[PDB]
Amino acid sequence: GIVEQCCTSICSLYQLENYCN
Amino acid sequence: GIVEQCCTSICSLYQLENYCN
Amino acid sequence: GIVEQCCTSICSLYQLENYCN
Amino acid sequence: GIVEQCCTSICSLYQLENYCN
Amino acid sequence: GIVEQCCTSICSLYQLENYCN
Amino acid sequence: GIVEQCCTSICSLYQLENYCN
Amino acid sequence: FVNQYLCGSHLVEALYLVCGERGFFYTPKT
Amino acid sequence: FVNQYLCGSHLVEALYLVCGERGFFYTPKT
């Protein structure tokens, strides 16, 4: 999920863009 | 929407919960 | 206190409502 | 109280210190 | 650097002020 | 100033990127 | 409008606390 | 009220920082 992928390492804007509708 | 209901008046924790998934 | 109790484990809203005067 | 002193005009840190315990 | 000085031990308000312009 | 430009109308991220080093 | 945008930023943090493990979808213009 | 309610949110964060170990009381109106 989002917590396991982004709280373990720093997600970039691109990878955060994945969660926008 | 959530904006019209809660940025125009203070919404309680109980009406915020209606927006929960 | 609240730190030793809510920073070692996730206090829920009912647990936090206890520090409201 | 704090809301009408500090939400009407900006309080400096020194003025904010007046509400510490 | 600021990260090295304030992210293990808490920096006081006066130490933070060294990073002001 | 970034304040004049972005506290008025919403600045997108790529507009805010012109203020980085 | 900046005002409503800044309110939305506070709305999503309140949803985070209230909804917990259920999560939420955030929709700004219904 | 909204604009004041949002300002209150910033006020309590400024207090935590300023007051440190002393702590503080937040009573919007008592």
Place this chain on the structure above:
Amino acid sequence: FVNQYLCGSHLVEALYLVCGERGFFYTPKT
């Protein structure tokens, strides 16, 4: 072990600035 809990409140606010009007959806693990 409150680390992930504190990180998710920062995720939600980064998601808010990135997505915008698009909105986003926040699902902790379902």
Place this chain on the structure above:
Amino acid sequence: FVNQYLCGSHLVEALYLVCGERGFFYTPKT
């Protein structure tokens, strides 16, 4: 310790939202 320091600042925002009108007291030194 910074870890308990950052955790507290999330606790005071949570108290603000849950206590509402009633307000709260934040005494870390307990």
Place this chain on the structure above:
Amino acid sequence: FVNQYLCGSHLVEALYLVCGERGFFYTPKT
């Protein structure tokens, strides 16, 4: 006064997210 001050608070957090490793200079009157 206070609403431009509250808006700057959110601006600095958006700059932190966008500028990442580069960093930034934040000057209100310049």
Place this chain on the structure above:
Amino acid sequence: FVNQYLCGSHLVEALYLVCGERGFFYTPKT
């Protein structure tokens, strides 16, 4: 874990409060 990164976004809000009108510089290098 992203502990330093989360500390950094807290440092940027603390500097905004402390420094006021003067502004600050934030550079994470090294």
